[PDB]
């Protein structure tokens, strides 16, 4: 595994924020 572990980037709500 090697995905970027970025808790500051909310992967559960990002699409809503970006509209």
């Amino acid at each position: 595994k090697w995905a970027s572990l970025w808790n500051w980037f909310d992967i559960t709500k990002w699409l809503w924020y970006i509209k």
Partner: antibody, heavy 119, light 108 residues
Framework: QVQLVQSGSEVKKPGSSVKVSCKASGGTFSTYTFSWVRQGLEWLGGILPLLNIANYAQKFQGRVKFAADKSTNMAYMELSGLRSDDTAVYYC????????????????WGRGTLVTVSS | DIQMTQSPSSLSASVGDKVTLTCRSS??????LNWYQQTPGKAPKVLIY???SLQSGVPSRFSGGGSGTDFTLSISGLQPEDFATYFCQQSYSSPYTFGQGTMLEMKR
């Protein structure tokens, strides 16, 4: 019907690592987020395959990694430093898409992967 | 960081009864609250999301309510397949935490 197919049962010694697999069937990863939840139910973390970004619960800091293969539509979690209390069924679960609402829920679940940690 | 607490831990009821389960959050979570049902040997399944929205296909005898810290799930006329475990779960902030579950058992 978007479904999740999980890899088979695992038996691991303490201190080793395990990689669980979750394959999206009847559909692709698209813009969705996929998390692992073990069983009380406990979220470990998840991955956004579109951007190759993962989030994690602080409890598993330094112990959890995630990956995804967009060609095969398969996502992975690696849990290392295994302890006997990591024995659980590990579900992969898709989040509802946040484009419609940030008040998300787990809308697709895999059947679970039994991971037994023992000497 | 947000503790979810469910009551009661176990409930005995009969087919056709109306029951209300409770979930409480240790911090205000608006209505970022989901209810799941689980039967032995099977993965959980969402019933209610955003505190009161019914997932497509879920019988209308299920309802939910609440906003802030106190939430309820009501089953108006329990059917045999409703005798299961119910979990609440907050989606307000990470780590996304589940309640401990309420198990429904049948009276005799």
């Amino acid at each position: 019907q978007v479904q999740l197919v999980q890899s088979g049962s695992e038996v691991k010694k303490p201190g080793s690592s395990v990689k669980v697999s979750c394959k999206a069937s009847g559909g692709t990863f698209s813009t969705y987020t996929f998390s692992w939840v073990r069983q009380g139910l406990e979220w470990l973390g998840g991955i956004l395959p579109l951007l190759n970004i993962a989030n994690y619960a602080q409890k598993f800091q330094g112990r959890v990694k995630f990956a995804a293969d967009k060609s095969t539509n398969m996502a992975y979690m690696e849990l290392s430093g295994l302890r006997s209390d990591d024995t659980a069924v590990y579900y992969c679960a898709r989040h509802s898409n946040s484009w419609f609402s940030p008040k998300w829920y787990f809308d697709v679940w895999g059947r679970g992967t039994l991971v037994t940690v023992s000497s | 960081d947000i503790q979810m607490t469910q009551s009661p831990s176990s409930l005995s009821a009969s087919v056709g009864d109306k029951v209300t389960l409770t979930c409480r959050s240790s911090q205000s979570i608006s209505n970022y609250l989901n209810w799941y049902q689980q039967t032995p040997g099977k993965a959980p399944k969402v019933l209610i999301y955003a505190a009161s929205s019914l997932q497509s296909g879920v019988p209308s005898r299920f309802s939910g309510g609440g906003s802030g810290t106190d939430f309820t799930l009501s089953i108006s006329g329990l059917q045999p397949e409703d005798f299961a475990t119910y979990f609440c779960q907050q989606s307000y902030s990470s780590p996304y935490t589940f309640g401990q579950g309420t198990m429904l058992e049948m009276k005799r």
